[PDB]
Write a protein that binds this DNA or RNA. Structure first.
Ligand SMILES: [Mg+2]
Ligand SMILES: [Mg+2]
Ligand SMILES: [Mg+2]
Ligand SMILES: [Mg+2]
Ligand SMILES: [Mg+2]
Ligand SMILES: [Mg+2]
Ligand SMILES: [Mg+2]
Ligand SMILES: [Mg+2]
Ligand SMILES: [Mg+2]
Ligand SMILES: [Mg+2]
Ligand SMILES: [Mg+2]
Ligand SMILES: [Mg+2]
Ligand SMILES: [Mg+2]
Ligand SMILES: [Mg+2]
Ligand SMILES: [Mg+2]
Ligand SMILES: [Mg+2]
Ligand SMILES: [Mg+2]
Ligand SMILES: [Mg+2]
Ligand SMILES: [Mg+2]
Ligand SMILES: [Mg+2]
Ligand SMILES: [Mg+2]
Ligand SMILES: [Mg+2]
Ligand SMILES: [Mg+2]
Ligand SMILES: [Mg+2]
Ligand SMILES: [Mg+2]
Ligand SMILES: [Mg+2]
Ligand SMILES: [Mg+2]
Ligand SMILES: [Mg+2]
Ligand SMILES: [Mg+2]
Lengths: 84, 81, 102
RNA sequence: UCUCAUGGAGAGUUCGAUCCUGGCUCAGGAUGAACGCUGGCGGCAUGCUUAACACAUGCAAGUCGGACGGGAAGUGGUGUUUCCAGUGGCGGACGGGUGAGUAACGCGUAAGAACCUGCCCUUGGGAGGGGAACAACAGCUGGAAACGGCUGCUAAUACCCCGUAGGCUGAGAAGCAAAAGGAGGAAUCCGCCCGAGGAGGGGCUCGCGUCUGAUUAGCUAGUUGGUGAGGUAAUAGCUUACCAAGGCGAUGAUCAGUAGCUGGUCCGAGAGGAUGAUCAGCCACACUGGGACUGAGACACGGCCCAGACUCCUACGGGAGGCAGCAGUGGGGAAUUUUCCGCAAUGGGCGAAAGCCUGACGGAGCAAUGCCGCGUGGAGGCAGAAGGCCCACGGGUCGUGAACUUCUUUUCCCGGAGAAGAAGCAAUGACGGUAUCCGGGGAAUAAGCAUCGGCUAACUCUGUGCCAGCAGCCGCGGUAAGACAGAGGAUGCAAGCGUUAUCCGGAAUGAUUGGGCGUAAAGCGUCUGUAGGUGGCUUUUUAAGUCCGCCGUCAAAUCCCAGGGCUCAACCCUGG
């Protein structure tokens, strides 16, 4: 709700991981919810993330040019592996 | 610095002022953040809500010459200190 | 007779304050150079010695004196002086940590 | 039989005629308006949209002698005192003007962390002892002038050192850091130094929204990322060395063109479309470019340095300047104002105070530019007449209109009285003898513009003969023209009326609301399939979307409802 989730594609760089964020919002003229995409750059000093993982972002003071976020784990998920 | 003065808004040759607290370097018709009174010389009427004015004076607001006189006729200074 | 000109007066004052501030900054520049030219000489020398740190302890006082006296005047901001003094203390510990003192 | 709903109009033109389809045109409202004809007043507003073209002249930022040394005037050339070129302090980064540039944290909205902040407020502790200079000034000296040069003297809230420290650097040991006095019947206020906070202001980052073009598809190399060393008030490739090869983009990168943004303004049944004058906020620029000093704060409209173009002065060696500040000139253009009064009010800067400055602002003047309001007479006027036009020649119309008779005086003229705005004991008013009130005179001072073929309210006659000419569309005129010109009459408006230009509506004519593709314009020649879009049924999970209840915010002004005040209205104000 507050922060933005995203997929962590292109995690090749050192101490950094490119992240793809997705959101839906209604079109102002026609009122249809369109899936828009926007990328960001975050940092994981432990390098605990790799491509294929699910990651959450947080605001922080700027680390470099265009890298102004911090990668954290997700809060609310629905794994629920094999519940009755 | 914060200051308690009054701006003009009305008709030509009919002055109708309102008291307001704004920055000094801002112009006469500057962006307001709290209107704390109303006044005119012709009709000589005044509302002059005291709870808002004391909030600024505690924080270093300096009235002008006439606003000091308006507040002087009121008993706000005796309760201010 | 000639009249006044307050704008020209600010030009006259600025040149005087410029020479004061220009000289006051260059003092901070040269006194640092005595330190780093020594630390570069003390590092390449393989002979460890505690007595050789006392002249450096004399220059660091001359540096902090020139810097702190400048903060009193209108040249440098207080956070600026902390960065210059920290650069001296930081680079000093490099010789301490590179060698066996730590 | 409740309540909601105050809101959607069409017409002409293709055909011999009809039903459709589809364009063109008109009736509405608005304007920073312009032109044409005409023109009485008052109130509130508005007034270079083009050449961010170039500018004569005057003003637009100064202030403190209760910071300091000197100098001048006056006096009884004696005391008090008045004035200031210079040193020093604060303000000259506010206010004012202009949208050239800018397609992006610039703006709007909603959040954040790694920072600064003079003046104001609050608060904890201090100000001890010494010294050296530049100005002014005095002498000499170079210049046409602007401005200097040399030799010596001097004060300070100006300069320097020592001493002290609840602060700074550092893992620590240790090292470093300040200050100014002034006025005074002496209580004792204005200030100075260090440190911690409050408010306001400013800097930085981020989410969302933010023009057109694919006959611009590849762009970037300090470019994306790190480390180390730097640097900034502070985070940051902000800078640099090395290393890694990433970063942006067909949901439109890059390139090109256009443009200040917003609150809002206009139109619209609404959805939404167009737009960004005045007022208010942010940003940006200051002859064209570049750079830095000063300061708490600038890369500074009326500050400095350099280059370039232009203008002016010159004794030809050398100098001065930047109205996109007020007013005003030239030029451009269809077109937009006095080279005015005043700091009385409001607001701003300096000062302990008295007071000084304030082309901001408050007022006046010009213009029918717009909106609103009131006049250019009311009542009566039997019968009859002159006159214009028309006629079936009997009459009809202009026409109760006029004449005439009484009544009244907004307005007009004359003569008096006369403010509020002023806050502060009194005095202190640019506007201003202004608004306003009383008295006298007397219908006396005041209506024009377009249209009259259909859309579209309003008709005949004369003249002209596809001529002269009208026209928004259809189209009228070729000898009886309701369509041209004149006349009379009528209609619609009214100190305005019409023309032109620009935007919206009508236009469902880009059809989300709200259109269509058999033959009227419109289904790729066909199929397979990537991205993308959508997706059967049943029970659970979560609560992103969605719905409900609260909190904060989207400034004020404007719009909407109510209330009040200007004699009403426009308009102004209060509240929501
Ligand atoms: Mg026909
Ligand atoms: Mg212009
Ligand atoms: Mg003083
Ligand atoms: Mg003086
Ligand atoms: Mg200052
Ligand atoms: Mg000392
Ligand atoms: Mg770069
Ligand atoms: Mg880094
Ligand atoms: Mg432009
Ligand atoms: Mg419509
Ligand atoms: Mg110019
Ligand atoms: Mg300036
Ligand atoms: Mg100028
Ligand atoms: Mg001008
Ligand atoms: Mg004044
Ligand atoms: Mg004043
Ligand atoms: Mg003056
Ligand atoms: Mg006209
Ligand atoms: Mg009559
Ligand atoms: Mg008709
Ligand atoms: Mg005609
Ligand atoms: Mg005829
Ligand atoms: Mg005719
Ligand atoms: Mg439409
Ligand atoms: Mg159709
Ligand atoms: Mg056909
Ligand atoms: Mg066809
Ligand atoms: Mg297929
Ligand atoms: Mg509002």
């Amino acid at each position: 709700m507050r922060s933005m989730q995203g997929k962590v594609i292109c995690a090749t760089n050192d101490k950094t991981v490119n992240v793809e964020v997705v959101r839906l919002a209604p079109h102002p003229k026609y009122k249809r919810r369109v899936r828009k995409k926007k990328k960001y750059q975050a940092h994981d000093p432990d390098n605990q993330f790799k491509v294929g993982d699910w990651v959450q972002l947080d605001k922080c003071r700027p680390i470099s040019k265009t890298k102004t976020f911090l990668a954290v784990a997700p809060e609310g998920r629905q794994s629920s592996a094999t519940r009755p | 610095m914060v200051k308690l003065r009054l701006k003009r808004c009305g008709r030509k040759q009919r002055a109708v002022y309102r008291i307001v607290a704004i920055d000094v370097r801002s112009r006469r018709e500057g962006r307001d953040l709290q209107k704390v009174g109303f006044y005119d010389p012709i009709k000589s009427q005044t509302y002059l809500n005291v709870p808002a004015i004391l909030d600024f004076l505690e924080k270093g607001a300096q009235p002008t010459e006439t606003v000091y006189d308006i507040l002087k006729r009121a008993e706000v200074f005796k309760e201010f200190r | 007779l000639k009249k006044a000109d307050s704008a020209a007066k600010r030009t006259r004052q600025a040149e005087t304050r410029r020479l004061r501030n220009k000289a006051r900054k260059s003092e901070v520049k040269t006194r640092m150079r005595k330190v780093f030219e020594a630390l570069d000489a003390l590092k390449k020398k393989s002979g460890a010695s505690t007595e050789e740190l006392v002249p450096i302890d004399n220059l660091i006082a001359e540096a902090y004196s020139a810097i702190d006296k400048a903060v009193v005047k209108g040249t440098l901001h207080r956070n600026t002086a902390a960065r210059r003094k920290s650069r001296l203390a930081r680079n000093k510990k490099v010789v301490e940590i590179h060698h066996g003192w730590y």
